[PDB]
RNA sequence: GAAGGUACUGUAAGCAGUGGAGUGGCACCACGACCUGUUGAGGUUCAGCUUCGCUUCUAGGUUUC
RNA sequence: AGGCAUGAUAGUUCAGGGAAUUCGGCCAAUUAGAGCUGUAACUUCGGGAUAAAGCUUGGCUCUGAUGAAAAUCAGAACCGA
RNA sequence: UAUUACAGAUCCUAAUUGAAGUAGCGAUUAUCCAGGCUUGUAUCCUGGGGGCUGAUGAGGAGUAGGGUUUCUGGACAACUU
RNA sequence: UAGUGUGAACGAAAGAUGAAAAGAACUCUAAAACAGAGGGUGAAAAGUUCCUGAACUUGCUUAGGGUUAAGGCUAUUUAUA
């Protein structure tokens, strides 16, 4: 019943390794709604246009990793809103919480 | 004739069925046939499949072409913890067959053996199984079953099982008592024991029951089953593979390239009479998984595992551990492991049962001198430079 | 050769309205092959005795010539 | 509902591809009821339809 | 996620230089494949690789004797 | 929506050998554009002839010639897998 | 008194099985995310990414032929694998 | 006539509510001209290509057989010879 925010990164190589090629944009999102829907244990996934562009960008054929805020919503039915956080380096960045 | 040409059979016939065998551990077949008298002496010992290195010997074989000269040779290593004695049993012979004559058991029993009598632990609340530890029941009625034993039963065989070892959990500190204990896992995963019977081979049956009870309920280890220079046969299943098509699992000369519906086959399965398709003819199915023995693997050296000196030979007198440096699939060998010569069935992280030989060699190849000059401790990912971190820091002491 | 491929290019009529069958008439010998125009006669075999009768008197209307069928019956009856 | 008839109008007025003409998506009731050209010039000239410029291609 | 754990590639970008075939301009600045320094760097490393870390997360359903 | 063994089909690549395969070099591979050399037997003297067989080709900073011309051709430095 | 008795004629006409929830659902660039309208959309529309066609273009227009397929509004029993 | 062929020509399938439409109001579940369930009309639902409604095939319920492909005949204490 709680709500909450969660920041992770979410591994996106191996998420996609040996996966048929042209399919890994696609592949890629799938494994984010997968992977939010697990951690907050939510049925609906929603993903913001802003991290949707963010995979996409370097074309069909994905970045290796992505930091999301996934964040736990009513509408009680409860709704996850991963979305995109922007960083320099992925160097010492653990799941952690929000406040 | 006939055929039009000769050419030898595609395939043995005496490993059918090619198909999946489900033991988890090499199941032996028979034992050697007891010499008689003698000392009981146990047989079989369990050990995982580590991994594979190579190693440097320096040959002596009196009139060959390699006589005083370095060779080098392939070595599996298979890891084997010291595994502990619970049950006892008797084999009475009969008309039919061997028949058993009960099982006797250890005072308590470890809840490694526990795990084996369910497929759900987890959901578990009760965990009842083994409830020997009544006062009156047990105790009583041993001593009467192993009178029996010595009535009927001719041939004696040892329940062993593989200890897991226990643990403390995640960040309480380990050594201290208010902490709650745990078993950790194999290198595989599993805290369930492979539970095995070992047949005694010592004489007189009574002389065994001696030895078979002053052992129980204490650990083996492998220094006081098999011994250096000894011709040892692995029995374990082999490395999976899945279907497969005819070409690749019998070995058949696939067709011309001009053939419509392809050329990954066996073209003629029969002849019109008889009208039937025989078990003899090449087909689709099953590869690898399949149960194995394999005879006369040497033993080149017994390990011990803080000096770790296990690694290094007579020479050099540089100290190097025996897992290659980087440790792949596996875990790093804290324990009594075998260079067996060779090859040796199924992958890493396999239950591989040893089995002392059926039959002697006369061969002198048997006999042989072994010497280890040199072992190699590279990392296997991919191309290893370095032998140990040592020459690593002496190699290229300034880096970032 | 003779039967997909070739059917492609069948744009052309043959056979146009005529006006005298109103049903066939050829464009390029200008005859309705059904009736016979232009000739005076119209065409009719005795080979097709039965495909004559659905053109011939009693398929339209007859409305000259029904109301002559209808005294007779008065003058014989 | 759909507004499939007012960019093909919107086409013709800007002189255009319906590939160019962007719409808004806060004001679909407004564009969705206007039927005839000279309703459509009228939201033209409030910036509710407009004519984007043309991608780039340099030399 | 971290490892002076292990691999593969082969020296990231950006900045600096009495470096650089030369050309052009002001009274030493423009443009310059590339080379030297920062830099065995940067990137990738289980997806079927190894070590240890309480950073984060772990819920329900139906028959069987 | 999810899997990826086998097989069919369309594709890259294959140590050493190089037609031993096969009715048969079927197939595929090699060759290739341009500039400068250089071109045989035979011939109906026109052809053969792109015969065959060799070499050079990038990037960057320049110099010169011919035009009216903002183009095109020739030549030299220096650079690195 | 007769257009008078059917198991067959690769018989005639009419309906119906198993095979079978099986074979198979092709060819054509590539889809993804948030909104709108709804009992209900990846598909109908909007916006934003990522793509395709790549001037003999699924672009803009005509002969021959088709004949209302054009346009707006409402509708989904069927059809547009 | 539908329909086929450039054309001469060729050419089907398809009858029966009840005496009388008295052709099923109104309410309930439902997004609802989906589909029912109540309630009614009529002598009887015969309820709209609706009289009677056979066989093949199928569904549900009840009862037995089954290593002998199944079926038949003879004999009895009915599952055997």
Not at chain 2, 7 to 20: I, K
Not at chain 2, 337 to 364: D, E, Y
Request: proline residues 3%.
């Amino acid at each position: 019943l709680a709500p909450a925010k969660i920041e992770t990164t979410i591994h996106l190589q191996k998420a996609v390794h040996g996966t048929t090629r042209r399919f890994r944009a696609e592949r890629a999102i799938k494994v984010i709604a997968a992977a939010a829907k697990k951690m907050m244990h939510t049925d609906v996934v929603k993903i913001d246009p802003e991290l949707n562009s963010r995979i996409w960008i370097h074309g069909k054929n994905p970045p290796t990793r992505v930091r999301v805020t996934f964040e736990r919503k009513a509408d009680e039915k409860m709704i996850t809103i991963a979305s995109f956080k922007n960083v320099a380096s992925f160097n010492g960045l653990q799941t952690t919480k929000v406040v | 004739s006939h055929r039009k040409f000769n050419a030898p059979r595609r395939g043995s016939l005496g490993f059918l069925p090619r198909g999946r065998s489900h033991a988890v551990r090499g199941r032996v077949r028979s034992w050697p046939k007891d010499d008689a008298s003698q000392k009981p002496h146990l047989c079989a010992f369990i050990g995982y499949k580590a991994g594979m290195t190579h190693v440097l010997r320096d040959v002596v074989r009196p009139n060959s072409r390699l006589h005083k000269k370095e060779a080098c040779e392939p070595v599996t290593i298979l890891e084997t913890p010291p595994m502990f004695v619970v049950g006892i049993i008797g084999y009475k012979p009969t008309v039919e067959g061997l028949k058993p004559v009960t099982t006797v058991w250890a005072s308590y029993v470890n809840e490694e053996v526990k795990r084996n009598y369910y497929k759900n632990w987890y959901q578990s609340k009760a965990r009842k199984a083994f409830s020997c530890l009544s006062n009156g029941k047990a105790a009583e009625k041993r001593e009467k079953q192993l009178e029996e034993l010595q009535k009927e039963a001719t041939v004696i065989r040892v329940i062993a099982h593989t200890q897991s070892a226990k643990t403390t959990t995640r960040g309480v500190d380990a050594n201290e008592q208010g902490a709650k204990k745990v078993l950790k896992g194999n290198h595989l995963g599993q805290k369930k024991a492979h539970m095995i019977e070992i047949q005694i081979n010592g004489g007189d049956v009574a002389a065994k029951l001696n030895y078979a009870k002053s052992i129980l309920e204490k650990e083996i280890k492998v220094a006081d089953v098999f011994t250096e220079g000894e011709q040892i046969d692995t029995i374990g299943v082999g490395k999976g593979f899945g279907w497969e098509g005819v070409i690749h699992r019998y070995g058949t000369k696939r067709l011309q390239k001009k053939t419509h519906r392809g050329r990954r086959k066996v073209a003629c399965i029969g002849p019109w009479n008889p009208a039937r398709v025989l078990w003899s003819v090449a087909r689709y199915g099953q590869r690898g998984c399949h149960h194995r023995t394999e005879m006369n693997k040497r033993i080149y050296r017994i390990g011990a595992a803080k000096i770790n000196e296990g690694g290094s030979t007579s020479f050099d007198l540089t100290k190097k551990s025996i897992n290659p440096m980087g440790g792949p699939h596996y875990g790093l060998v804290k324990d009594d492991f075998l260079m067996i010569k060779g090859s040796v069935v199924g992958t890493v992280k396999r239950a591989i049962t040893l089995r002392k030989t059926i039959n002697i060699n006369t061969r002198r190849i048997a006999t042989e001198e072994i010497n280890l000059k040199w072992i190699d401790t590279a990392s296997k990912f991919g191309h290893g430079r370095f032998q140990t971190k040592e020459e690593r820091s002496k190699f290229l002491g300034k880096l970032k | 050769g003779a039967g997909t491929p070739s059917f492609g290019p069948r744009h052309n009529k043959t056979h146009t309205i005529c006006r005298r069958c109103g049903n066939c008439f050829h464009i390029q010998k200008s005859k309705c092959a059904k009736c016979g125009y232009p000739d005076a006669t119209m065409r009719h075999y005795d080979w097709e005795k039965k495909a004559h009768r659905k053109r011939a008197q009693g398929s339209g209307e007859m409305r000259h010539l029904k109301v002559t069928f209808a005294k007779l019956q008065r003058a014989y009856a | 509902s759909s507004l499939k008839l007012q960019k093909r109008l919107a086409a013709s007025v800007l002189d255009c591809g319906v590939r160019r003409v962007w719409m808004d998506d806060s004001e679909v009731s407004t564009i969705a009821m206007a039927n005839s050209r000279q309703q459509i010039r009228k939201l033209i000239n409030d910036g509710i339809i407009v004519k984007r410029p043309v991608k780039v291609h340099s030399g």
